[PDB]
Amino acid sequence: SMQRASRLKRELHMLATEPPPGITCWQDKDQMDDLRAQILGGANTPYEKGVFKLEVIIPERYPFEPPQIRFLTPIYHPNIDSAGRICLDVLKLPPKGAWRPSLNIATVLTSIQLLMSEPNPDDPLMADISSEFKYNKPAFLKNARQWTEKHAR
Numbered sequence: 111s112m113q114r115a116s117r118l119k120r121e122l123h124m125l126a127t128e129p130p131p132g133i134t135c136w137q138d139k140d141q142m143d144d145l146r147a148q149i150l151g152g153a154n155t156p157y158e159k160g161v162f163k164l165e166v167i168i169p170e171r172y173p174f175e176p177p178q179i180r181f182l183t184p185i186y187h188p189n190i191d192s193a194g195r196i197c198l199d200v201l202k203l204p205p206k207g208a209w210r211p212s213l214n215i216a217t218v219l220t221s222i223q224l225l226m227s228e229p230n231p232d233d234p235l236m237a238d239i240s241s242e243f244k245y246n247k248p249a250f251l252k253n254a255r256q257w258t259e260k261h262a263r
């Protein structure tokens with residue numbers, strides 16, 4: 111689609127020139143729909159000083175379907191599984207999800223960054239991590255720092 115191509119050119123321009131703080135997103139090679147991203151661990155979170163790489167695949171029906179995004183860097187988190195799958199509303203279409211075409215790549219990467227600082231334990235992909243987050247926060251923070259040290263630094 112040329113509608114899709116023109117939109118991706120604009121988004122890549124905006125990601126290059128006005129990236130959200132802590133976030134970078136780029137073309138892996140020469141295809142505007144095969145992207146990579148990076149989110150820095152937030153300050154005052156157990157992921158601080160980690161650098162987290164993500165894969166960002168733009169489906170054929172974008173912007174009417176959401177970007178398909180998974181962590182490539184392992185992360186210890188209630189809403190992200192061991193393969194990097196992310197449970198987040200803006201990465202899914204209605205009725206269950208929140209994606210709409212007025213969101214964009216920068217918007218959902220910012221939502222993922224926020225998810226990292228503020229887990230949603232009521233909708234987990236990792237039930238044991240979620241219970242630990244809810245009921246033994248000091249142990250969750252220590253495990254999340256150690257996982258960051260081992261895999262993201």
Ligand SMILES: COc1cccc(-n2cnnn2)c1
Pocket residue numbers: 196197198199200202206207208233
């Ligand atoms: C609030 O609960 C929700 C809402 C929307 C999507 C999800 N998903 C989690 N993993 N895939 N979708 C969970």
